[PDB]
Amino acid sequence: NVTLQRKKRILKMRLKVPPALNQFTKTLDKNLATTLFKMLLKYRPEDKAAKKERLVKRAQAEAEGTKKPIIVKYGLKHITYLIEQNKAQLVVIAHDVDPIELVVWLPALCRKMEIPYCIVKGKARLGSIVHKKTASALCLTTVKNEDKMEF
């Protein structure tokens, strides 16, 4: 197992990489990545415990006779729909999606739809934001008005 994964890394860089696959090596800079990830942490989806805790605050509210949340959108199927509908303002793509065919076309779609996109390192890092083991890509449909300048 160790030998195969090391030969796999070598073989990739020995062969000529077509441009559509070579664009994923040009990931977002480390300095800007931290700023982007810091903002994402401010729009994390609610946890399982947090999700249950609000659904009981509503059941009691319903018995005793409200604002749209602003959170990160995840899921390749859902993100692609947002991009096509032109409701996405920023697409974050993981550079290490295997198989790569799942996202090798995303940069072209974002470019054609005039939606800014970035390629960041770590699908596991993206998954941690949305409380998942991994995430192929993230999307921001709208940020809170209090921080629309830095965004």
Partner 1 sequence: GAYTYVSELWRKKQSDVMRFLQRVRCWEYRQLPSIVRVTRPTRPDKARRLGYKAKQGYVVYRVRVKRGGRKRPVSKGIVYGKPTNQGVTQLKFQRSKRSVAEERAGRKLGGLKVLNSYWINEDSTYKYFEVILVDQAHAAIRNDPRINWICNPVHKHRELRGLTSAGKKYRGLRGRGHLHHKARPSRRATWKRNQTLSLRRYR
**Interacting residues with partner 1 (CB under 8 A):** 4, 7-8, 11-12, 15-18, 20-21, 76-77, 79-81, 84, 99-102, 104-105, 109
Q: Of 87, 147, 148, 94, nearest to 120 (Cα)?
A: 94
Q: Which residues bind RNA (CB under 7 A)?
A: 1-2, 5-6, 8-9, 27, 30, 33-34, 45-46, 48-49, 51-52, 54, 66-69, 71, 73-81, 84, 94-99, 102, 121-125, 127-128, 130, 132-137, 141
Q: Which is nearer to RNA, 104 or 121 (CB)?
A: 121
Residues 6+ positions from 115 with CB-CB distance below 8 Å: 83, 86, 88, 89, 90, 91
- The entry of RNA, partner 1, none near residue 48 (CB within 5 to 8 angstroms by kind) is RNA
One-letter identity of residue 66: T
Q: Which is nearer to partner 1, 53 or 84 (CB)?
A: 84
- The entry of partner 1, RNA, none near residue 43 (CB within 5 to 8 angstroms by kind) is none
Q: Which is nearer to partner 1, 104 or 118 (CB)?
A: 104
Q: Of 23, 43, 65, 26, nearest to 144 (Cα)?
A: 43
- The entry of partner 1, RNA, none near residue 14 (CB within 5 to 8 angstroms by kind) is none
